[PDB]
Design a protein around this ligand. Structure first.
Ligand SMILES: O=C(/C=C/c1nc(=O)c2ccccc2[nH]1)N[C@H](CO)Cc1ccccc1
Length: 350
């Protein structure tokens, strides 16, 4: 019988690791995406099955631009769904097609967290095992350091959250962790000369936090949105909090949000949706879909991160009269290369 070593993590990090690897949180997420967890359990999830589902969706994509019913029936056989034992709806719109692609991008991140927890033979040939939470923490290959309430960047982040959060239903700050993805430091070096660095929000499903802490923010071949195939960020917390899918934990609703250091370089501004973009125009390093409002730039502050100055908005959203006429209520900041982002903070919000 193998000795289990004591946990080295603080209570807040223990809770975080428990939540982002929680089998119930993963099964809940699959129930919320209408998947059949009985016909497709977490242990049975495979990369081949997810690849097969994307192939069916790529085939359905062509048929929109074999009937839609035949091709939909094949997708629903590969990726089992639960719909009160009724006929599954045919994927006959670019909206329902992107929804199923978003569902599969989440499920691929669930599979990743599942593949990551696989007990290897090198782990089986050791007489002392780490505490389960230490083991899951170590599989991330990502240093997480709980921030102190007295650290200067804690107050800068808290102000950013409070000033740009939803006016009434303001998310309550619980914890801030410094994120040091060991692998992201060397890739971000290939953008050291690129200026205009800003700390921006990235809100997400609890089910994809583990995959992001292991692999960073990525541009997958089937991802998209109103500003094309890139990594999406916001200068307003309330905008990113909309993509935060949390979970019921007692009386509270716990969720996680990221702060990323984004090297924006030369910005290209737009005021109309362009879902076909895959890069900025020549000479530009980022695209900004300009909102009706923007955190007051007069109140911007800076943080020094690895010798570089990073702009941190501190002001409340104020009108952008040039972009009063914009299809975007709130701004969306886009980069089209993964190396232009560096994960810096992880926030727990209730
Ligand atoms: O995880 C995300 C989106 C995160 C996201 N997070 C943001 O912080 C954000 C800010 C500005 C504009 C878009 C933004 N999108 N999307 C998933 C596909 O992988 C699907 C999804 C998740 C939540 C709500 C709607 C769709």
């Amino acid at each position: 019988m193998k000795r289990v070593q004591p946990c080295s993590l603080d209570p807040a990090t223990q809770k975080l690791i428990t939540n982002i690897f929680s089998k119930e949180m993963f099964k809940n997420t699959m129930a919320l995406m209408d998947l059949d967890v009985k016909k497709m359990p977490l242990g049975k999830l495979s990369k081949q099955q997810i690849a097969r589902g994307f192939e069916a969706l790529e085939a359905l994509e062509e048929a929109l631009k074999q009937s839609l019913e035949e091709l939909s029936s094949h997708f629903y056989t590969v990726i089992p769904h639960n719909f009160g034992h009724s006929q599954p709806p045919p994927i006959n719109s670019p909206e329902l097609l992107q929804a199923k692609k978003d569902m599969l991008l989440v499920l691929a991140d669930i599979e990743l967290a599942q593949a990551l927890q696989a007990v290897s033979e090198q782990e089986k040939t050791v007489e002392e095992v780490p505490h389960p939470l230490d083991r899951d923490y170590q599989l991330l290959k990502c240093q997480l350091q709980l921030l102190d309430s007295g650290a200067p960047e804690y107050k800068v982040i808290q102000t950013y959250l409070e000033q740009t959060g939803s006016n009434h239903r303001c998310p309550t700050l619980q914890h801030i962790w410094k994120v040091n993805q060991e692998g992201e430091e060397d890739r971000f070096q290939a953008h050291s000369k690129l200026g205009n660095r800003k700390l921006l929000w990235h809100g997400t499903n609890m089910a994809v936090v583990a995959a992001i802490l292991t692999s960073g923010l990525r541009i997958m071949p089937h991802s998209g949105g109103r500003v094309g195939k890139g990594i999406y960020f916001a200068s307003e917390n309330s905008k990113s909090a909309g993509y935060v899918i949390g979970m019921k934990c007692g009386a509270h609703h716990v969720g996680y949000m990221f702060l990323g250091e984004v090297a924006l370089g030369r910005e290209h501004h737009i005021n109309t949706d362009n879902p076909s973009l895959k890069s900025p125009p020549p000479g530009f390093d980022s695209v900004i879909a300009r909102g009706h409002t923007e955190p007051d730039p007069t109140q911007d502050t800076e943080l020094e991160l690895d010798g570089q100055q990073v702009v941190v908005p501190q002001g409340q959203p104020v009108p952008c009269p040039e972009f009063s006429s914009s299809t975007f209520s709130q701004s969306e900041y886009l980069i089209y290369q993964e190396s232009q982002c560096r994960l810096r903070y992880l926030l727990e919000v209730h």
